[PDB]
Amino acid sequence: AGAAYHEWKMALFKPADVILDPDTANAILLVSEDQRSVQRAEEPRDLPDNPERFEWRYCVLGCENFTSGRHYWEVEVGDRKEWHIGVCSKNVERKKGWVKMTPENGYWTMGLTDGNKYRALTEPRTNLKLPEPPRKVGIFLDYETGEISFYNATDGSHIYTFPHASFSEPLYPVFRILTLEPTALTICPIP
């Protein structure tokens, strides 16, 4: 049914326990007391000018990145209408604008927009036709082979796998939202 994806993930990938780094969060973002959720303000806070922050993109990272091995983590996206998640490099441009989010620029992300429109953020984009809409998403990484993939984490269905990439820089979990809406984005807990 949904199981097997469960067996597999635990058996073959090391669960990351990702917590949101608020030093990285764009001012319009609100990290939760627990640092698992992110939700969007109505208007930006004023926040200590910091190099690590995403001042153009409405992005937030993990505290902990990856340089080897196999890892996975899961994100309750629930019934949100817009959200993009995955990973990115330490060395992405956190200040300059109009750097498009592609693997070309260090972004292996994937998301949802205007409600029902799934897409992967390759160049060009690749739309995605998902039998069931996911309420929870599993992000999987193998540094060495250079592969990142996405699975519906309730039923274990596959979603997308980026083209192999030789990874030079460390990789952070990245999360991004722009809607202001009820349902938040939430890192699922490590078993």
Helix, strand, coil % over all residues of the chain, rounded to 5:
5, 35, 60
Name the experimental technique: X-ray
- Dihedral angle, C-alpha 175, 180, 184, 187, nearest 10 °: 10
Residue 118: other Cβ atoms inside 10 A: 17
Q: Look at the chain and report how many structural domains it folds into.
A: 1
Q: Measured between alpha carbons, how far is 154 from 112 in angstroms, rounded to an integer?
A: 17
Closest CA to 48 of 20, 19, 23: 23
Question: What CATH number is associated with residue 169?
Answer: 2.60.120.920
Is residue 79 within 8 A of residue 184, CB to CB? The reply is: no
In degrees, to the nearest 5, what angle opens at C-alpha 131 toward C-alphas 82 and 134? 40
Is residue 151 within 8 A of residue 111, CB to CB? The reply is: no
* Distance (Å) of CA 73 to CA 131, 174, 189: 22, 12, 8
Q: Which domain holds residue 129?
A: 1-191
**Cα 167 from chain centroid (whole Å):** 17
Structure-token match 């073959």, residue found = 12
Q: Return left, alpha or beta for 98; rule: phi > 0 is left, psi -120 to 50 is alpha, else beta.
A: left
